[PDB]
């Protein structure tokens, strides 16, 4: 939805709509969206989207953030053009 402002709030949608959710079946649904969101955080040539996608993460997803593939996405973020993205990344 290449129109900038769609992408921003669609991120802020998917995050909060995931936040409310043992069995594999629900956890699989969390994982499925969670990675497909995270891609954008490193990917987007509109830099403040990269900012907001990272900002949308929290302790509220810490178990999946302890996953190695995601740690690579974090390490990739940990080096960047935009000082504020780096400042946010180190906290995680």
């Amino acid at each position: 939805s290449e129109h900038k402002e769609i992408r921003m709030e669609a991120a802020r949608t998917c995050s909060r709509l995931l936040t409310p959710s043992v069995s594999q079946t629900a956890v699989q649904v969390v994982a499925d969206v969670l990675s497909k969101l995270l891609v954008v955080g490193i990917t987007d040539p509109d830099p403040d989207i990269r900012y907001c996608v990272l900002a949308s993460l929290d302790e509220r997803f810490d178990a999946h953030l302890a996953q190695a593939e995601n740690l690579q996405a974090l390490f990739v973020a940990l080096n960047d053009q935009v000082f504020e993205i780096r400042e946010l990344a180190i906290c995680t």
């Binding site: 069995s23 594999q24 079946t25 956890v27 699989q28 178990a63 302890a66 996953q67 190695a68």
Partner: protein, 1044 residues
Amino acid sequence: EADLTDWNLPLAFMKKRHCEKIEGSKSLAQSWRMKDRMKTVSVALVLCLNVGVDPPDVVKTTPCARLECWIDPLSMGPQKALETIGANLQKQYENWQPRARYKQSLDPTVDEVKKLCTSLRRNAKEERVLFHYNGHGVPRPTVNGEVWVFNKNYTQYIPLSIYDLQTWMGSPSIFVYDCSNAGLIVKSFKQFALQREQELEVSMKNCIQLAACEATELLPMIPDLPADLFTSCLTTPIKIALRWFCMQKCVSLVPGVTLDLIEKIPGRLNDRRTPLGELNWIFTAITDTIAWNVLPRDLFQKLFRQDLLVASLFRNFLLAERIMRSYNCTPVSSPRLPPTYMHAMWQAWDLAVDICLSQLPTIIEEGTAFRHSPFFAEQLTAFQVWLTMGVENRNPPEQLPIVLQVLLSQVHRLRALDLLGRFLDLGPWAVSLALSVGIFPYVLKLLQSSARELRPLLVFIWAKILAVDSSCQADLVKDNGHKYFLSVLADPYMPAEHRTMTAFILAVIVNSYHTGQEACLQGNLIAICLEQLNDPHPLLRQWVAICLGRIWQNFDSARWCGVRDSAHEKLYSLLSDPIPEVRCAAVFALGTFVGNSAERTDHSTTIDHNVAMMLAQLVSDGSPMVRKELVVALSHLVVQYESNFCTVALQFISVYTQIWRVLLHLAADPYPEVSDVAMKVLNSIAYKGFCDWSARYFAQPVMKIPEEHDLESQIRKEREWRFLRNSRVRRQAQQVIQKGITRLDDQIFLNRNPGVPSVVKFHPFTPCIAVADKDSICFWDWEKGEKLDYFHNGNPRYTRVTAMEYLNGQDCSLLLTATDDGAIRVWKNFADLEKNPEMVTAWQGLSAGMVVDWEQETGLLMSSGDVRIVRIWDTDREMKVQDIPTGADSCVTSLSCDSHRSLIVAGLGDGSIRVYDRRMALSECRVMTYREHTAWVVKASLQKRPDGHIVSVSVNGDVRIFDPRMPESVNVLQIVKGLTALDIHPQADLIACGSVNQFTAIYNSSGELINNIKYAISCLAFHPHWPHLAVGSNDYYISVYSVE
């Protein structure tokens, strides 16, 4: 609470759809079965140095790289010290392997070289020789791979005979080239090997090579380096790593460290508890981990698992790649390796060193008891995390080579063994991955430890391996380990699961080959197995009986204990088993007990005859699988009873004929595979397996969590939306009754359907009116008013499909059909014309008149006919289990088995009505008899109700109403005196009369009447809730009636 009622409402044959789908598989690489053990011959050590004589190529400087094997010759006895270094270098190689030889070869000329290499090669040809060299006091190698030594004269040029060495090393060997242009030696070796090819046109190079630099490069001269750097790495990696490390960074975050202290780390480079053991031990794990990560799959085993002194110095090669790329070197290998220097695991090494050497500036002096490294604790945690999500089989976890070290290490073994258990409990890839990583030799060795901890651990692991693995071949039973299993077969100190696994493992050891049946005599396995018949866990009783039935393979010396300590008779307690899987497992074992008895007769004829007569009893079962396994236990008896059967077979044109009689019972069975199984076994005699289902289960994951608590689980989401719907249906379908009855002012349909009036059934919420041809299941749609289809029940056309029932109503619309000859058949998938139907089960239940009453109400099936009895059928035993007689002798023609007063009515073949308290003793069942009918009872509606009244009709030509607490017919409707079709529906309180006229007649329980409407008919029924009528009519036709 509709979806709770929908699951509370029981269902039929639920497990029976599972079993026959017996799994198969194909053999892996499974190269943990590793073959080749060419070790090493000897080390050449062509130590060409000419000590003190500068090869004129070089110009030194005072700050000179000087040390070799950490000796300086300049400050030592010159021509003497040339020996010392050779012994030193051998002693370093002996740390990596001493089980091979050494010649210390000092400035050798061609003749000396020829003697050294050819003598050693001549001692062993296929075995690996170690070529090792140093290029010192000897100029750079020639374009054509040659050398510079003769009688130690003056660094004298000599041809190296390298193209002859190429057949001296033509069979397996290894080469090391410590010189200023080694990649040139390797390149020129290819040109000579290509010249060998250019002869062979009439092993090009399997042999390993390690090159101290690439051809273009020249060695470093920084005095802080040992001069033999490539060797020094390949020989003493720890000293190098520490001595490299301490120089590298440009602020020392631990500042106390110096060269002086890293000389004096405590230990002896062979004790994990000491710091000098610990760093090596960590390094040992790291290198394998990179190798498994970054190499293509096979190459890893080929270099790092086939052979010791191949692998061990190869680990050091990666450490060399790092330091060399620090400087201006790019050392190179016989095989075409990918690069490694960058990899993240190296930073785990460097942190582990920093943690260690933070302490050493006190330990050296202050007697500090040192703090052991956290490396393994940190590592297993990461693996534990990937398991704990366990969310996939993708990018499988790289910590796997670290695990192997803790399987040995007593300090931390427990946690690792559990985690490994969970990993092995995942699907077969994880098993295959552990196996191909080389877990096997540890899992082989560790059963040496009779520690009770291996019961939930290594035994469970062994169980899951063997669940897929046929290639393990009682290995730990030709080896010592089995003594473990011989305890936890019978050891009671833990739950029966642990015995279940062990009974399976010993049942595998006897499954494998006669080695297990020998192992039976090596530990009296029969007697201790019979002790386990008594434990409650049904899959233990199964594995115990499949164990004993495999013990009685052709190894008849085992059957000697089975005879002489009465195993076969004792085992009949598991013929008294309600569980049809356990029943089959015992039936199988008695099968092989007789069958495999090496054609032994005499006293065994008398004893095995009792086994045959005892087996002959269990024909009782609607179970397809007991019906097969009974005939298969008889085909097992026939494994030696074929020695007697030819004349016995003629008797139907004692006990051999009781087997024959039982085979003659099952050959007619309405399930085609059961009639086939008995038919083919009769026929084979006339012309003259289940354990794999037990195996097919055991691969399934145990730790993974059952579904229905998850809101996203599809079984639950289907149930929760689709079946909760029926709250509105169970209301709406009765709302016209709630609101009071109205005129029959409409019809849905009047046309052909391909079925006879011998059965009619209305499906409550969903459209199939079943009206069926006498051999059929066949259908039409009441919702839309539409043709559905004919299908075949499969009974022969002199018989009659006589009744039908649904094993729910809404969700899983399973259907039963029953036949006048008895034949009971059960059906699926036709239910919304999605696809082609199948028969889930069938049996010849009831072996004049036939009747049926299924209870969705309670989970029981009932039926009656020529057996002079109402059979009551249980799906938990898969049997007829209770039996109520005709009371008189004229077999039953209409019935209800009420369970709301708990009664029966039997409308009899003599037209009398029998009413039964089904709590009375079975010879005395009569509460009432009525005789206002005396021909044949056509209708016998004992309503299953609080007002459980009787309406009944007979071939006498009259209708009457009777009350079970009165000896009489009490009241009358008889709106037509008596008629060819009637119904009295217990949730509508309406009646419909099969008028011979072109208009059907319709009336009320009040004796009132309603409008007669268009179509003598032979059957009709009202809907289970709606005050609406289906008329299965006559002449392959239906008509349907309603309010509008």
